[PDB]
Ligand binder design. Structure first.
Ligand SMILES: Cc1cc2nc3c(=O)[nH]c(=O)nc-3n(C[C@H](O)[C@H](O)[C@H](O)COP(=O)(O)OP(=O)(O)OC[C@H]3O[C@@H](n4cnc5c(N)ncnc54)[C@H](O)[C@@H]3O)c2cc1C
Ligand SMILES: Cc1cc2nc3c(=O)[nH]c(=O)nc-3n(C[C@H](O)[C@H](O)[C@H](O)COP(=O)(O)OP(=O)(O)OC[C@H]3O[C@@H](n4cnc5c(N)ncnc54)[C@H](O)[C@@H]3O)c2cc1C
Ligand SMILES: Cc1cc2nc3c(=O)[nH]c(=O)nc-3n(C[C@H](O)[C@H](O)[C@H](O)COP(=O)(O)OP(=O)(O)OC[C@H]3O[C@@H](n4cnc5c(N)ncnc54)[C@H](O)[C@@H]3O)c2cc1C
Ligand SMILES: Cc1ncc(Cn2c(C)c(CCOP(=O)(O)OP(=O)(O)O)sc2=O)c(N)n1
Ligand SMILES: Cc1ncc(Cn2c(C)c(CCOP(=O)(O)OP(=O)(O)O)sc2=O)c(N)n1
Ligand SMILES: COC(=O)c1ccccc1S(=O)(=O)NC(=O)Nc1nc(C)cc(C)n1
Ligand SMILES: COC(=O)c1ccccc1S(=O)(=O)NC(=O)Nc1nc(C)cc(C)n1
Ligand SMILES: [K+]
Ligand SMILES: [K+]
Ligand SMILES: [Mg+2]
Ligand SMILES: [Mg+2]
Lengths: 598, 598, 218
């Protein structure tokens, strides 16, 4: 009995027990902001040399920082905030983390247990409020169960599909002292089924029949270090073209001839064409989101036909049962970690040397469907597509890892399209929820996770405005992030839809911007402004050469659509393509309708 | 039947129906931010001349602006945001509005009904998430019921205790066209009980026995235009001293000899002493919050004794049954609108000319308990208390209404203490939830509600950092707000508690500030910086004389406690008072413990 | 099992998916999961204060409920307290049997359909000792008019309501406790009783109680 009980925590406050459990969970970074209810915990971690504490200006900042940290590092991002508004301010990051499968462990202070349910000072029902945007949450009711709850939080956050959890910490609990022994298993952190094994064998047989296979790879492949390696091994062995989601960018080396780039609403028309014509689709850690599938009833016609004729279909490697057969029917569902299952899958897969006809089509499609756009003309503003290419080309020449975060909008899509993605966990972007303001704090979190990486925040002007106060946080944290604001002086993604669907009626989609150079100066951040084509190259070089936090503002062309585009309701291969003459006609129409204003 | 049905909306989109219903509800201002899901509504309100649209930089800004608008005007504050992150970003303002009884009507875009429950693009379960921080919410499921839901939202938000409501608007609903007639009652916006009448008579008899009455007035008295008038009439007739809550400031003219100022944790020791010794407490629209009562079991000993002896007690005028007998037992509960019930109450109350002994005590208490503090000394920094007094004195000399908003912290308490409050709805502060960052957007909302008022945001440096991006919003909205940042370069309220309870262990309570003058310049806002005593007067005058948005930074003394203070767990009359010698000893102790760092 | 039997006992539900109960355990599990399972300074002071209050009382009454039945020594200690300080005992419906009703100190059941003697006694008592009872609305009658003498005594610092309750949710839920003693009532009675002065006679109080019992039979 004495062997199974532990008394080593007796005499410690809940706050001190929190500190010890962070150590045992190998937490090296905490993002947070103090307040009355969480003071006993902050007193306990006072001048701790056991982890780095990062202070934002806003708790949403802490949340998105922790997300950026988590996605760069593969570790859970830990948040420590106070009760009431401190806790409700993390709701958007929690919802964000849920949608994008990010392991987030949020610790929120709470009013004393004696005051709960009285509409107390700074009391929010955060357990109730955060229920729909967490995998799991809990309120610790006494200090003896605090180690257990912390263990459960970290375990749930990092297993299955990773996601956010919240642990509510009443002030009197964290201030109270443990007076009793607790089960020693609570003071410590933590074979394939017959059914799945048969599914894998069946899936292998299906692929070995395929004449037009395609790999559809997503974020799930990034949740194991061997993920990208095994993805490549499968693609090489069976000779299979690979397309990825937005969140899967970097999982496959896009310089490889087998790369079909990104698929979806704003993905490559080559990738979209390929998946619509494939007879076997191998889904690796991707959830068939509605940005990817296009019109669902018209999605993957050839794979569905192949399935019905017993010569192909959809092979879904998925860890969460909830996302199996949720959107499309899987021909074979392989449940569990995709990387682990790939180890069993690949040796059953026949090695294939050549697919002449299939790859002939794929090469033809790639040739006719580049990410085309209207190039600069004499005197014109810098095109946002060209800017992204410039940054991508110059960044690649440093002997450092390059991590990209983004805001939400056109700049985000152009970043996805025109960067060349080659390494895992280098695209850190808000995809599921699509939170504007994500870019800057995520970059700070990623930079803290990877002190030797070049971290670039490709941001929109409207997105950057949402959370720009966190510039001071970057300086205080010593995070030499590189923010590039694509200043088109518009909410470009929304104006694109207003141009296309609402006859150029731009309803409240032009926010006024601050002077970004004076802003950067006020924040003690280096400032660079690029206003014309002739400054692009040297401006970007100064941007990347900087060894301090730096804000680059680039004046780019306005009212430029992101293309290709699969409009809502259309089949994935029913795309809008860039056309020089159509763009000019669009400009004329917009100019006339707005009386020359836009 | 034709008389009861209405076909006048047939042919309109849900968006257009939304626009029409705003008009019928006399909405003159909408605060919001666009996005994909809410586009059909934004298209409908495109270039509307029927109301002013105010665009923030962040949806939290929109929420707090609408709160500031609501509290300045007495009208509901209307918010219009998109799905997902647009909606989750308003959660803190909603929770804020619930705690402080603010009528907030939040309209949030939602993904099409066909996509709900699929983890769709930018889909949040906002109805689930906002359930605990709204009076009521709903998702509109078809356009025919949209007018009804809008009516219900406005009605619920503005009746009983006012509070926030949310209406979820699926994109396909707002885009769809009404093809059928709807009940004409849904196209249009909208006696005392025997039991209450007897309660009032009994309450009058109790007061007519009282020898030491006191009025404890709160926010509820402000929810009727005649509120302050009848409060004054009662106080005059029965000769009763009046104390108010933080949220009740301005309900009673503090220049009146009967004024006991604010009560509570940081309220006047005179007020706190008076309520602890009163034999009859008349609670007018106040909810006995834990910041006000002190130790609940030790609260109002004399009133409880009087009640038991049938010669006094607590008379609670309250509109919400949930807050009757929630914290303390009411001797008589008078349910309903306090102002309406005061009309029945006062004529039953005996007129009283003099209370020599009671008012002798009260005058003695007021004399011995001023808001004392350590004055400036040669070469010292400006004391924050002195700054507030300077602003209060100079602001009063303009022939304009003066409205004050605040952030959360020491500056907020000092603002409450050292302003002289004389007019209703002039203190607009986050009290229940206590949200830092509230000050600036609330000021913008209040300024929009009252274009001819002087609107002053008394802000802390940490609080201002939370939402400072909204400076550009003030400029774009043409709101000439006046922001005063009390820069003590600390989270002062938290450091006060760390000084007092945690032996001067300042754990992560010093955020780095931007250059506020360069910041103001970047935001196209006038900037003023006061650094020494000799600049205080002229600096504040320039601040108030400005006819444009202006940011005043004042360097004030650090590590200064807000006093008086009733520490948690102590009786309301068990207060800490300011003492010159104790402050000096505290300075010495702090200096030694921190090695001269603080 | 732990949650069901600790604090205030209550129901719990465990949902068992068919495929889970049919599936076979293929892995080791923490050995602590294969096995079933001091008074605070604050409560100790509350008990001392409660004892001092009772030692002043001239008209005490014990109001005992189901909570006293959740410990085998419950009834024994209830009797020991009643005997030592010479206190009449009334019980709730759910507390019936906790006290021997043949005892002269028994006031029978109180409440809506309880003894008028018990109801009269609690309305006139200056100190009410609530032992494992939750002041239900079948028991209190009109809440604002409940226990006038105990409330007066509390205000005058010579009595009030002493609430021995294990669940914080039921403390100060209905009526304000003069002293709240949190935890198992039986365990706290062991600390309480030795601080309570032994009393031989209460002539006037028990004269009234005997008069009330005489005039209010069922
Ligand atoms: C403006 C905008 C436009 C967009 N357009 C596009 C577009 O054109 N193309 C595009 O691709 N995206 C687009 N998106 C993003 C899109 O909404 C989704 O966020 C993204 O497609 C999801 O990619 P994912 O499925 O790979 O990642 P996730 O959403 O995280 O899904 C990962 C799946 O793999 C599972 N999984 C996780 N871990 C494992 C594991 N270890 N083993 C097995 N399975 C696992 C998860 O349970 C989940 O089912 C856009 C976003 C925005 C804001
Ligand atoms: C750092 C900090 C320190 C604070 N310290 C203090 C302090 O020392 N003193 C202080 O007073 N506050 C203090 N507070 C604020 C405190 O937390 C509460 O917000 C405030 O006391 C509530 O005041 P109120 O009851 O008047 O308003 P409310 O919280 O809005 O309560 C109003 C009550 O009146 C009712 N009501 C509403 N309308 C009507 C009507 N028409 N008719 C009848 N009834 C109606 C409502 O239902 C409600 O019950 C502090 C806040 C902060 C952030
Ligand atoms: C038609 C009808 C008429 C009724 N009229 C009457 C009436 O006239 N008189 C009457 O008495 N009842 C009456 N009732 C029953 C009444 O509604 C309640 O059920 C009953 O009064 C509750 O008694 P109780 O508080 O002792 O038990 P409970 O309801 O179980 O409350 C026990 C309290 O003690 C606490 N507790 C539990 N265990 C412990 C522990 N180990 N230590 C400390 N505290 C503990 C519990 O948390 C709880 O607060 C009537 C019921 C019906 C159906
Ligand atoms: C918090 C929030 N609000 C609203 C939206 C809706 N939204 C809005 C308003 C976009 C415009 C983005 O503007 P930007 O300047 O940041 O980027 P681009 O101009 O390059 O598109 S994109 C988008 O999805 C959102 N995604 N997040
Ligand atoms: C969003 C949020 N986070 C945390 C808190 C907790 N908190 C914090 C961190 C305060 C310090 C306020 O700093 P300030 O500079 O704005 O004002 P003062 O220095 O005058 O106190 S006050 C307070 O209640 C809060 N109220 N709101
Ligand atoms: C957060 O409030 C509560 O948790 C809280 C809420 C209700 C009752 C009691 C408490 S508390 O006593 O346990 N803690 C505080 O009151 N903290 C606090 N209050 C102020 C005014 C400023 C600061 C820095 N801290
Ligand atoms: C918000 O999303 C949905 O509501 C949504 C969600 C899931 C399915 C379908 C839709 S939608 O077809 O009805 N609307 C959009 O897709 N809007 C949109 N999308 C982008 C990428 C950029 C902009 C400006 N708007
Ligand atoms: K690319
Ligand atoms: K004052
Ligand atoms: Mg833009
Ligand atoms: Mg400060």
């Amino acid at each position: 009995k004495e062997q199974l009980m532990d008394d080593s925590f007796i005499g410690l406050t809940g706050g001190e027990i929190f500190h010890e459990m962070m150590l045992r969970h190998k937490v090296d970074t905490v993002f947070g902001y103090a307040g009355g209810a969480i003071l006993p915990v902050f007193d306990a971690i006072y001048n701790s040399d056991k982890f780095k504490f990062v202070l934002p200006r806003h708790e949403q900042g802490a949340g998105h920082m922790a997300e950026g940290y988590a996605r760069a590092s593969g570790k859970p991002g830990v948040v420590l905030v106070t009760s009431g508004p401190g806790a409700t301010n993390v709701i958007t990051p929690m919802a964000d983390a849920l949608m994008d499968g990010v392991p987030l462990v949020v610790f929120s202070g709470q009013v004393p247990t004696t005051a709960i349910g009285t509409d107390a000072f700074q009391e929010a029902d955060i357990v109730g409020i955060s229920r729909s945007c967490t995998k799991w949450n809990v309120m610790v009711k006494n200090v003896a169960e605090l180690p257990r709850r912390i263990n459960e939080a970290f375990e749930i956050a990092t297993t299955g599909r990773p996601g956010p959890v919240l642990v509510d910490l009443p002030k009197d609990v964290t201030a109270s002292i443990l007076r009793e022994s607790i089960p020693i298993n609570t003071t410590l952190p933590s074979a394939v089924s017959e059914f799945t094994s048969e599914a894998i064998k069946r899936a292998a047989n299906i692929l070995n029949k395929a004449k037009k296979p395609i790999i559809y790879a997503g974020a799930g492949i990034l949740n194991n270090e061997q993920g990208p390696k095994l993805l490549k091994e499968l693609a090489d062995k069976a000779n299979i073209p690979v397309t990825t989601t937005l969140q899967g960018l970097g999982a496959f080396d896009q310089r490889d001839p087998k790369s079909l780039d990104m698929l979806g609403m704003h993905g490559s028309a080559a990738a979209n064409t390929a998946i619509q014509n494939a007879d076997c689709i191998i889904a690796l850690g991707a959830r068939f989101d509605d940005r990817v599938t296009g019109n669902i009833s018209k999605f993957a016609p050839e794979a569905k036909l192949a399935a019905s004729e017993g010569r192909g279909g959809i092979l879904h490697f998925e860890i969460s049962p909830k996302n199996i057969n949720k959107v499309v029917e899987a021909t074979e569902a392989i449940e569990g970690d995709v990387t682990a299952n790939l180890q069993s899958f690949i040796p059953l897969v026949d090695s294939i040397e050549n697919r002449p006809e299939w790859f002939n089509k794929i090469n033809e499609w790639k040739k006719k469907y580049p990410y085309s756009y209207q190039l600069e003309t004499p005197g014109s503003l810098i095109k946002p597509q060209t800017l992204i290419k410039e940054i991508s080309d110059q960044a690649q020449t440093y002997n450092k890892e390059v991590i990209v975060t983004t805001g939400v909008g056109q700049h985000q899509m152009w970043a996805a399209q025109h960067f060349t993605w080659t390494q895992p966990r280098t695209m850190i972007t808000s995809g599921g929820l699509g939170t504007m303001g994500y870019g800057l704090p995520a970059a700070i979190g990623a930079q803290v996770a990877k002190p030797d990486a070049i971290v670039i925040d490709i941001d929109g002007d409207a997105s950057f405005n949402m959370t720009l106060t966190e510039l001071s946080s970057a300086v205080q944290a010593g995070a030499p992030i590189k923010v590039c604001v694509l200043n088109n002086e518009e909410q470009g993604m929304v104006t694109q839809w207003q141009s296309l669907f609402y006859e150029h009626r731009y309803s409240h989609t032009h926010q006024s911007n601050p002077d970004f150079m004076k802003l950067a100066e006020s924040m003690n951040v280096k400032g660079i402004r690029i206003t014309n084509q002739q400054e692009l190259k040297s401006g970007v070089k100064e941007f990347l050469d900087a060894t301090e936090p730096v804000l680059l503002e680039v004046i780019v062309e306005k009212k430029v659509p992101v293309l290709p585009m699969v409009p809502a309701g259309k089949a994935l291969d029913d795309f809008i393509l860039w056309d020089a003459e159509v763009e000019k006609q669009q400009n004329d129409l917009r100019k006339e309708r707005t009386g020359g204003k836009y």
